[PDB]
């Protein structure tokens, strides 16, 4: 049985750099799955509407993939993790793979809501961030990396993201079991979670 | 070989003091815990008049040089009698406990981790994190129930002088924690996490 360490946070937040530090420091010892990567496939639709889907609400996710994968990797099986494109609005056809681990990172912004992943959580963590400070880094990555406008990134900030993460992703908070600041330089907070997630090597 | 030292900070009822005693118990004789809001000035000079209008929530309420002084002591090896603070009667009692050096020392107080003299001490930097409505409900029953006040009394203070300087001093130094700690009072995970770190360090000291 593979120890579970959730890490939630708000775009931005750090829960990204966080989680990839501890998969770093830990090496093999870690199968990490972002849920970012776990969009539902509507390649389907037209682009104008996946343009328009809010991507912050639960819904957008698929959840049932992302469970199976979870319970997968504890069962100590391989899984096909979906690629997201970013800039192209779509799932890509080709998946990569993540091997099984004694230590299993589930990482993303709603990964508190569900009862059913917070149930497979040993630790439960929220990378917390102001708002603004975080913006700050959201508006940076989706221009440098997400082929996005300011004027774009502004539009879907309001009318989606900053709703759906008071509605959704904050009072997740609430189930957190650590709260860890700075998310993106916090030295102290990842050499004691990298322990923590060896305590159960060492049993 | 040098000690492990953590310090736990928090709004006032935040729950530093149950996660800290509760820290402390977990390592048993292994750990020495500091309360800073021991540490008041000893103003028994004073009448009480003057004694019931200090503001005890502002950083010049508290005696740092004597907190320091003991747990710089506690750090060398060296034992201290800790003063104990009479809150019903608003003054420094006569009173003493006993502290024995130990390996890991925890420094927690509403305001432990303002001064840097104190926060160059410590190895992690905990801050306990609670709504202040709910702190203040706790606020008020152990006020009530082991301080000698009155709901009349608490609200006032509370509101002329907790509750200002909580968000002048306290709350920003929030800032400096490495990890912040939910429900302080009631947490086993977190408890466990910290409880184990302190172990990993122990286990350190004695290896070679
Ligand atoms: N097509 C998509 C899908 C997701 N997203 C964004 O992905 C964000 C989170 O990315 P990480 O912060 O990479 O999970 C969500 O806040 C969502 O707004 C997007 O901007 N465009
Ligand atoms: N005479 C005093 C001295 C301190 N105090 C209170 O002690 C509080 C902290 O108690 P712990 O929270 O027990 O330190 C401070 O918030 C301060 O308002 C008091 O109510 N009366």
Redesign the interface.
């Known amino acids: 049985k593979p120890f579970v360490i959730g890490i939630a946070g708000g775009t931005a937040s750090g829960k990204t750099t966080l989680a990839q530090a501890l998969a770093r420091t830990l090496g093999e010892r870690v199968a990490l799955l972002p849920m970012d990567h776990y969009y539902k496939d509507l390649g389907h639709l037209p682009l104008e509407e996946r343009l328009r889907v809010n991507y912050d609400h639960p819904d957008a996710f698929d959840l049932a993939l992302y469970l199976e994968h979870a319970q997968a990797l504890l069962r100590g099986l391989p899984v096909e993790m979906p690629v997201y494109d970013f800039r192209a609005y779509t799932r890509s056809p080709r998946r990569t793979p993540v091997r099984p681990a004694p230590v299993v990172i589930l990482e993303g912004i709603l990964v508190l809501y569900p009862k059913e992943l917070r149930d497979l959580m040993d630790?439960?963590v929220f990378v917390?961030a102001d708002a603004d400070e975080r913006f700050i880094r959201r508006l940076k990555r989706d221009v440098l990396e997400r082929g996005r406008s300011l004027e774009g990134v502004v539009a879907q900030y309001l009318e989606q993201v900053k709703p759906m993460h008071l509605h959704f992703v904050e009072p997740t908070?609430?189930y957190?079991?650590?709260?860890?600041?700075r998310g993106g330089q916090?030295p102290?907070?990842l050499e004691?979670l990298a322990?923590?997630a060896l305590?159960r090597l060492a049993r």
Not at 176 to 181: H, L, T
């Open positions: 630790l439960k917390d908070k609430r957190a079991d650590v709260i860890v600041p916090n102290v907070a004691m322990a923590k305590a």
